[model samples]
Target: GSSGSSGAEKRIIRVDPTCPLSSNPGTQVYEDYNCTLNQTNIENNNNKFYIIQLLQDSNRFFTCWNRWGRVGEVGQSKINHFTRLEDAKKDFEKKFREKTKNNWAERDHFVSHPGKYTLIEVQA
Candidate 1:
């Protein structure tokens, strides 16, 4: 091992506070409102943009956008891929922890709701 070599610096992935992660499965079909929230030891690729969107049909879509060069650069329309659920879970947990630690839990409206929220069972 090299002496005093700390390895490469880790890159930070910023998450949106307004669109928090939800573990409750089932599609969120909102004709009015909207919402949303990545992997493993996988190497960091800036061109690959990860998106964990909660589809209207209630399925989670984990996508990786292969951008041309930078974060928001446009790329070929069909030049992207989706990662496995396991990797997506890892990314979700990581971001969730970071957001929670930064006071995201306090932002939950359900936490301050006067009445209980209506709960529905997801069709199997």
Candidate 2:
């Protein structure tokens, strides 16, 4: 199920169907994430979650646009911290290596401008 009725949810559009890169300017990819905080286990668990979106294109690799906070919390996640987009790019790249059988054909290739991508998040 989706958290919101936004049109950009769940549609996997990209430059390469296999890789899922963007063909146009960088776009935002959104997903509904849910994290449950069991009172019996994690005390500070507030079912806090991140509403995340991946950048369709970026000037560099490993950079994604995202907003992460608790679900139904008072405020929205602030993406105020900007670091080397390469770090996020690399982190996700590592995950990609694990997800697609390590097949080059299944992963998106890095390009000059039109680098496309899909959004992923942690949900229960």
Candidate 3:
């Protein structure tokens, strides 16, 4: 709900049963993540949204939306802008763990990457 500077580092990572961490180097490990629990994907909101991102300042953000609902509908989001990067990582990890525990898996094979991660931006 708040906007900040555009020149910030941001990484989008899909937290699914595929892998626990991004294979890329220099990535922070959200120590609490465990993909073995939740197995459902986004088809039915079973994974309850699997996108976890870290902002330029290391702030974390994620969303929860209705998978069974109609298209064009937006999901609700929560963020921890002030927490330490480590804590924020844990929060991000916990989200995936919860989704996995709920049996949430990917809806399709569109996410082809083994870690399903893509670094969207890294600006000064």
Candidate 4:
């Protein structure tokens, strides 16, 4: 185990989907949307890009995006995000009048809106 260490420090956290992770554990989709799970065409989509592709015969579409940890959500793209987190942070700071070290704050912002917030913590 010692020899395999790349010296890359990482932190892992687990929580209920409605807790701190609620803000943005992963990407989000609107209530009304349709999607095919893991479609082939979506394979090339950027790891950071979010999308809302229209269904075959209707205005309905599905949302998807890469959230923290590269976890992509497969559904309608309700909460659009910057292709780059730096942009997200910039937008967040601009919108909220505060500075953040990372996107967790932005994630929490999405979580704290309405009755969608809960609490969770991780340590390792």
Candidate achieving the largest TM-score: 3
TM-score for each model: 0.23, 0.30, 0.32, 0.21
**Candidate 4, residue 106: CA error in Å?**
16
**lDDT by residue (tens digit), candidate 4, 1-124:** 4566567665433222422223643433332221111112345553332222211112332223222322254322243334443454444334332212223335445333222222223123
C-alpha-based local distance difference test score of model 1: 0.31
Q: Write the per-residue lDDT of candidate 3 for residues 73-95, one digit (tens) a residue.
A: 33344434434556655655555
Off by over 4 Å in 3: 1-50, 58-72, 102-124
lDDT of 2: 0.35
All candidates: CA RMSD (Å): 20.2, 14.3, 14.2, 16.9
What ranking of all candidate models by TM-score puts the best one first? 3, 2, 1, 4
Candidate 1 residue pairs in clash (backbone atoms < 3 Å): 27-58, 38-91
Give the lDDT of residue 68 in candidate 3: 21
Prediction 4 TM-score vs. true = 0.21
Which ten contiguous residues of candidate 4 have the minimum total lDDT? 49-58
Per-residue alpha-carbon lDDT of candidate 1 for residues 1-124, written as tens digits (9 for 90 to 100): 7577667874323222223232334423222111121112234753322333222323444532211223344323322223465564454444433423322234344232222122122122
Candidate 4 error regions (>4 Å): 1-10, 14-78, 95-124
